[PDB]
Amino acid sequence: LIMDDLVEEYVETEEENLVEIVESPSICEGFVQASSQTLVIIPDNERITSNVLTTFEATRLVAVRAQQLAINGSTMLKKKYSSPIDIAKQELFNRKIPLLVMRCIKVTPEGQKIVEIWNPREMGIPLLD
Amino acid sequence: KQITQSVHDIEGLKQDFRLEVGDILYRDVVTGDVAFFNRQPSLERSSIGVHRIVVLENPKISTFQMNVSACAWYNA
Amino acid sequence: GEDSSMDDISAYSSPGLFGEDIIDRLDDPFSIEDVDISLDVLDNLAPQ
């Protein structure tokens, strides 16, 4: 009985050189749950990130708005359009998009999330064309 | 059909006669649609790009047709 | 000596190459293991 089509064999050859008494409490250790964070919004005069939307952020805004226009139907465009993509794009260009860009720069160990909330209607818009 | 949370094939929608708001329609690709165009191996950043679809209505054609100058993106 | 009943059936297959007994750990320089390209589109690797 020639079987053939063997499952081979697999070999790993390397080493991972990853460079007060105590007992078992259940509350001092463990706690897989992470502490709830508090949102610190950096004041509008202390924001040091770009006031021009990146192509990534502008694309994300347009995509989110287009999806929400696919589920909803409300908009502020005087010129009506037949596609949610067009409506969202013109909403971004006309500076009437109902979305905010939150840029997170910190995770403080005290459970503090420091963010900069940027208004796309006041921001510069990249090429996108 | 959002009202039924079900997908219907197009043969059984004679009683519909219309689509309601909230319905999702899966329509055929038309000229002007965006498509992702990719050659393996995908070595460079340009190895996947988005092209505007140009539907070729000749039933005797089965290839993907691209301008020759576009091949530099995919090393094709 | 003259028996073949439990003859080692590996020695029946005469050696084909020289160093068949040496286990070599360097990977094959022609494998497509780390190249994630489909089998049907292997023609894209062809020269011209």
What residues contact residue B21 under an 8 Å CB cut-off, 6+ apart?
A: A73
- Residue from C32, C33, C37 to probe the interface with B (highest B Cβ count within 10 Å): C37
CA pair distance A53, A120, nearest whole angstrom: 7
CA pair distance B42, C37, nearest whole angstrom: 8
CA pair distance A60, A66, nearest whole angstrom: 10
Q: Does B41 contact C37 at a Cβ distance shorter than 8 Å?
A: yes
For residue C34, the chain B residues in CB contact (below 8 A) are: none
Whether residue A45 contacts residue A64, with contact meaning beta carbons closer than 8 Å, is answered with no
Distances (CA, A) of A127 to A56, A59, A86, A117, B52: 11, 11, 15, 22, 19
CA pair distance B31, B55, nearest whole angstrom: 5
CA pair distance C2, A62, nearest whole angstrom: 86
CA pair distance A81, A65, nearest whole angstrom: 14
Which amino acid, residue C32?
I
Phi then psi for B60, rounded to 5 degrees? -85, 0
Q: What part of C 8-37 touches B (C-beta under 8 Å)? A: 35-37
- Residue from C44, C45, C48 to probe the interface with B (highest B Cβ count within 10 Å): C44
The secondary structure of residue A28, as a DSSP letter, is S
Q: Which of A114, A58, A57, A56 is nearest to A91 (CA)?
A: A58
Cβ contacts of A104-110, under 8 Å, gap ≥ 24:
A105/A49, A106/A40, A107/A37
CA pair distance A123, A66, nearest whole angstrom: 19
B48 at the C interface (CB within 8 A)? no
Whether residue A113 contacts residue A37, with contact meaning beta carbons closer than 8 Å, is answered with yes
Note the residue count of chain A: 129
Q: Give B41→chain C minimum CA distance, Å.
A: 6
CA pair distance A88, C35, nearest whole angstrom: 40
